[PDB]
């Protein structure tokens, strides 16, 4: 495998929903065609303070070459820097 980070264009913030999707990264889309697996990230406790998803991030998958797509829930405790499994309800 390979793991290659990237970045996103700020034409998403004005959407007022702020979940990422495939057509949001604008680097020619040259990697959207080359890849096999993608995992965007969203985390509500940045863009809001009072939003009731504190200590949670989520893994928006947007492309799967050999499988389907989905969405996953994980936590974040940024002072010792490790996501953990979310043993709880569904999304």
């Amino acid at each position: 495998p390979v793991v290659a980070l990237s970045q996103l264009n700020r034409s998403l913030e004005q959407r007022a929903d702020k979940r990422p999707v495939n057509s949001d990264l604008r680097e020619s889309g040259s990697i959207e065609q080359d890849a096999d697996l993608i995992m965007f990230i969203y985390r509500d406790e940045v863009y809001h303070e009072n939003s009731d998803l504190k200590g949670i991030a989520e893994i928006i998958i947007g492309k799967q070459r050999n499988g389907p797509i989905g969405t996953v829930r994980l936590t974040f405790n940024g002072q010792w820097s490790r996501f953990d499994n979310y043993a709880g309800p569904q999304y």
Partner: protein, 237 residues
């Protein structure tokens, strides 16, 4: 650049003995992290619940007098509202999945908003969502629209209870607004609540018979008060 044992001999220039590491392998560490994760996640879920709960309680705009406000801090003095309590208690007990609407009317200083707020507190302890308002605030919301969230909450909420319906004798608009609300609600299989000072007859030319048709569902709960005041006695602890 340095040996293992000697790296550790560099390490022991920091703390004493009696600090043994206890790991002894890797997969045991993964088990340990999994333990801590399953712990901290559930504790976090608890805290998230308490947050969401408070986000409700600060949103049900109730003014602080009627907050430390329950069935119990209600000094009974005659039967006239002993019946009111016997009805309001069972109203709460019957609220679970019912078209159960109530109205209050009578004289001020008789415990209208007190019982209303007690009800709302108990229903929020059950884990519901409610709201009360002043009719002028609805006016103000419809004006802010002409400068949606609060507008549509008045039909996305389970229960509403309404306050100060008689005043604003600049009428003919109040009626159409309240009609709009209550039709959207009662057609949607949900309750509401009113508060006033007048008899139903006086009330009915303000509020055409259709609205009270939308009120008189199920075992619709009419109540009317006649007590004298209480305000000279109250302190505000």
């Amino acid at each position: 650049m340095k040996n293992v044992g000697d790296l550790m001999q560099r390490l022991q220039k920091m703390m004493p003995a009696h600090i043994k590491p206890a790991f002894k392998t890797g997969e045991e560490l993964l088990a340990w992290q999994k333990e801590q994760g399953a712990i901290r996640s559930a504790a976090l879920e608890r805290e998230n619940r308490a947050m969401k709960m408070q986000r409700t309680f600060n949103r049900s705009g109730i003014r602080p007098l009627h907050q430390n406000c329950s069935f119990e801090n209600y000094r009974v003095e005659c039967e006239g509202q002993m019946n009111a309590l016997s009805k309001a208690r069972q109203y709460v007990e019957e609220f679970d999945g019912n078209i159960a609407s109530f109205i209050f009317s009578g004289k001020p200083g008789t415990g209208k908003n007190h019982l209303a707020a007690a009800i709302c507190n108990e229903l929020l302890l059950r884990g519901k969502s409610v709201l009360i308002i002043t009719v002028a605030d609805i006016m103000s919301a419809m004006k802010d629209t002409f400068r949606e969230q609060l507008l549509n909450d008045l039909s996305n909420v389970d229960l509403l209870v309404i306050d100060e319906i008689g005043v604003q004798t600049e009428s003919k608009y109040e009626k159409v607004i309240i009609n709009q609300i209550v039709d959207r609600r009662s057609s949607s299989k949900r309750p509401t609540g009113m508060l006033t000072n007048s008899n139903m007859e006086e009330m009915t030319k303000l509020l055409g018979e259709r609205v009270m048709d939308r009120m008189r569902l199920g075992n619709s709960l009419w109540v009317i008060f006649n007590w004298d005041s209480y305000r000279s006695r109250v302190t505000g602890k």
